[PDB]
Structure 1
Amino acid sequence: SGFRKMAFPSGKVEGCMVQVTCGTTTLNGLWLDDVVYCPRHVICTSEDMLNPNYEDLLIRKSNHNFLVQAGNVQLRVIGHSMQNCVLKLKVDTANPKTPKYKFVRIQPGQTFSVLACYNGSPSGVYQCAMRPNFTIKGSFLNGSCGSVGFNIDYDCVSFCYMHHMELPTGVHAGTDLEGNFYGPFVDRQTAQAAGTDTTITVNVLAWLYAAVINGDRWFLNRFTTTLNDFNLVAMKYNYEPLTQDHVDILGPLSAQTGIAVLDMCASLKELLQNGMNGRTILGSALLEDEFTPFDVVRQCS
């Protein structure tokens, strides 16, 4: 019993974190096989950051302009290339701690673990979701760029995020490991702003299912809803639309608890209307949207 925001064990990722230095800038890189991945903005100076021409900045660099430090050891850079918004530094040693891995681009609503790192050394691990507005609500200080997000379903690490920047509202933006940004963001210091965020409806429902599995039914009611009426109400509280895909995805949790998906939708409508009236659900006084259907099955009996 219990329900916690639970991260993956971080050791497989810790063994891959290095420090990348270019000029006066130091940040984190990810060392897999004989390649070090890091944000391309490492090559920017103070001037550059508003309108950097990365191709022009990079052509001016040699291999030995990049200092890569893995623990106490310097790695030798023997090649470099840029792919989208990541720098790939080819090094002369394959990382002996390279885990089985892959690169996956995730969708909004997906969760992952972040290993926050400074100077190539891990500081902490926490669980995040990709928000509907393509930001993450992380915890990051200066020097954290190049920290990564991952899942480890099985023994295979799926890298899905690399940290590039903090927006003015204090939320975070980054790329997949192919260097493509999530959302409309760019790696420039121009004024850009996250869109209005919404609540991840399918995850809230998943979490209501978790509460039922863990023995709590107080918030259920005798009613049902059509999918369309559910969406008409939920969007008035800035909830994401629920799609038939989402309904299908919740089918296993529906079967385990004996509560139909649109019946749970009816419960959610009433919760939005009434609030909790001094009660909690799995120890929360708010409706939690950073647990996916898959996370609930992973964690719950």
Structure 2
Amino acid sequence: AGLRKMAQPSGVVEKCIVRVCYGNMALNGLWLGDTVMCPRHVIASSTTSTIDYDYALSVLRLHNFSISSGNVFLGVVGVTMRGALLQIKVNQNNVHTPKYTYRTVRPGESFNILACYDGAAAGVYGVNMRSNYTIRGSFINGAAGSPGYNINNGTVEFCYLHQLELGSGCHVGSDLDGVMYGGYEDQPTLQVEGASSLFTENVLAFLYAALINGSTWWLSSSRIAVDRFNEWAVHNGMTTVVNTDCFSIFAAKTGVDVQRLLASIQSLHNFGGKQILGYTSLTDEFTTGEVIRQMYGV
């Protein structure tokens, strides 16, 4: 019983964190094979005015780098630009490099953040990509380069490198190809993120976990078709439901079908002073896959 936002174990990723310093700037990098990836603003001269990154790279003194894994310093062989990352060839292979891939995640997908400072892991927590391409993180200056990852079958799928905080405390990274999520700019300028919409299919996975854990007070016999729901959703800060077949396993072992949960969603959009698994408002941070593993282990 129970539902907790949890991360996958972080040990295979801890071995890949390095400290990247250049000038007055210090952040984290990811050391896989013989290359270190890090946010390119580590070579930016300032962060009040706009940054010309191609110029910053042209004047780069390779020797002014300082890349270390613990007290083991890495010699820099070359530095090239990869979108909003630097790709830094170093003179040593990371013998502890795991099997790994890159994948760019979509809104509604969960992944793990290994929050790092000074090139060392400090914390690990799960996040979920919001519709405005931000995450509800906890990062302070020096956290950039912290990786986001998933682990499947012993392969580490790297999907995020931390970059910046938006005007509100939303957090933005890029993928490992160097493409900023949501197209935000790694410039210290006025940019405001769009309005976030609750990912409904995640809200449904949460309510099913709530049912599986004995929370039923919010459940109605009242029932609403997917159609009239989507009409209400777009005026009420939620997304549309498309595939309901991912809820077949949940309907099957609770006896509760989506349309009843969808109608519960509209009533709960207010909990009346009550709680659901400790929450006093709807959360879209849990995916059906997370919920399935926590209730059944598969």
Shared fold, TM over 0.5:
yes
Aligned to 1:300, which of 290, 295, 298? Answer: 295
Paired residue type of 1:11: G
Paired residue type of 1:253: F
Q: Return the alpha-carbon distance in structure 1 between the equivalents of residues 64 and 151 of structure 2.
A: 34
**Contact 2:28–2:116 (Cα < 8 Å) also in 1:** yes
Aligned to 1:291, which of 280, 286, 293? Answer: 286
Paired residue type of 2:32: L
The residue number in structure 2 matching 1:252 is 249
Q: Return the alpha-carbon distance in structure 2 between the equivalents of residues 62 and 142 of structure 1.
A: 24
Paired residue type of 1:233: W
Q: Return the alpha-carbon distance in structure 2 between the equivalents of residues 97 and 89 of structure 1.
A: 18
Residue by residue over 1:91-129, the C-alpha shift from the partner in whole angstroms, topping out at 9 and shown as x without a partner, is: 111111111111110001111111111110111111111
- Aligned pairs for 1:255-266 within 5 A: 255-266=252-263
Q: Does 1:176 align with 2:184?
A: no
- Aligned pairs for 1:19-30 within 5 A: 19-30=19-30
The residue number in structure 2 matching 1:67 is 66
- Aligned pairs for 1:185-224 within 5 A: 185-224=184-223
Q: Return the alpha-carbon distance in structure 1 between the equivalents of residues 18 and 248 of structure 2.
A: 42
Unaligned runs of 5+ in 1: none
- Aligned pairs for 1:121-140 within 5 A: 121-140=120-139
Residue by residue over 1:20-50, the C-alpha shift from the partner in whole angstroms, topping out at 9 and shown as x without a partner, is: 111221110000111100001111012x653
The residue number in structure 1 matching 2:33 is 33
Paired residue type of 2:114: L
Q: Return the alpha-carbon distance in structure 2 between the equivalents of residues 299 and 103 of structure 1.
A: 25
Q: Return the alpha-carbon distance in structure 2 between the equivalents of residues 141 and 233 of structure 1.
A: 38
Q: Return the alpha-carbon distance in structure 2 between the equivalents of residues 276 and 79 of structure 1.
A: 56
Percent identity (aligned): 44
The residue number in structure 2 matching 1:156 is 155
Q: Return the alpha-carbon distance in structure 1 between the equivalents of residues 216 and 152 of structure 2.
A: 30
Q: Return the alpha-carbon distance in structure 2 between the equivalents of residues 250 and 125 of structure 1.
A: 29
Q: Return the alpha-carbon distance in structure 2 between the equivalents of residues 91 and 27 of structure 1.
A: 17
Q: Aligned with 1:252: secondary structure?
A: helix
Unaligned runs of 5+ in 2: none
Q: Aligned with 1:287: secondary structure?
A: coil
Residue by residue over 1:191-244, the C-alpha shift from the partner in whole angstroms, topping out at 9 and shown as x without a partner, is: 1111112212111111001111122222211122221211122333211222x2
Q: Return the alpha-carbon distance in structure 2 between the equivalents of residues 278 and 191 of structure 1.
A: 38
Paired residue type of 1:231: N
Shift of 1:17: 0.5
The residue number in structure 2 matching 1:236 is 235
Shift of 1:62: 4.3
> Runs in 1 of length 4+ with deviation above 3 angstroms?
none
The residue number in structure 1 matching 2:277 is 282
**Contact 2:114–2:148 (Cα < 8 Å) also in 1:** yes
- Aligned pairs for 1:109-128 within 5 A: 109-128=108-127
**Contact 2:83–2:177 (Cα < 8 Å) also in 1:** yes
- Aligned pairs for 1:2-21 within 5 A: 2-21=2-21
Paired residue type of 1:39: P
The residue number in structure 2 matching 1:94 is 93
TM-score by length of 1: 0.94
Q: Return the alpha-carbon distance in structure 1 between the equivalents of residues 89 and 246 of structure 2.
A: 41
TM-score by length of 2: 0.94
**Contact 2:45–2:56 (Cα < 8 Å) also in 1:** no
Number of residues of Structure 1 aligned to a counterpart in Structure 2: 296
